[PDB]
Amino acid sequence: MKVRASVKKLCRNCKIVKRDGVIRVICSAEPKHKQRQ
């Protein structure tokens, strides 16, 4: 669970989504990729 104002994709399964005014970055099989804006 990072908090950053410069989000990114890293692997081939990074899915940028937008939930409740927040640009989240998530992944299927990676706990470290999980993010928040």
Partner RNA sequence: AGCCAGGAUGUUGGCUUAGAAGCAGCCAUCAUUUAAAGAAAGCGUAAUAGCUCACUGGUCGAGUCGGCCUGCGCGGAAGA
Neighbours of 23 (CB within 10 A): 13
Are the C-beta atoms of residues 37 and 26 closer than 8 Å to each other?
no
Residue choice 8, 11, 22, 23 for contact with Zn ion (CB under 5 A): 11
Q: How far is the CB of 3 from Zn ion (least distance, A)?
A: 17
Please report whether residue 16 would count as binding Zn ion according to CB under 5 A.
no
Nearest position to Zn ion, beta carbon: 30
Residue choice 14, 24, 26, 37 for contact with RNA (CB under 7 A): 37
Please report whether residue 26 would count as binding RNA according to CB under 7 A.
no
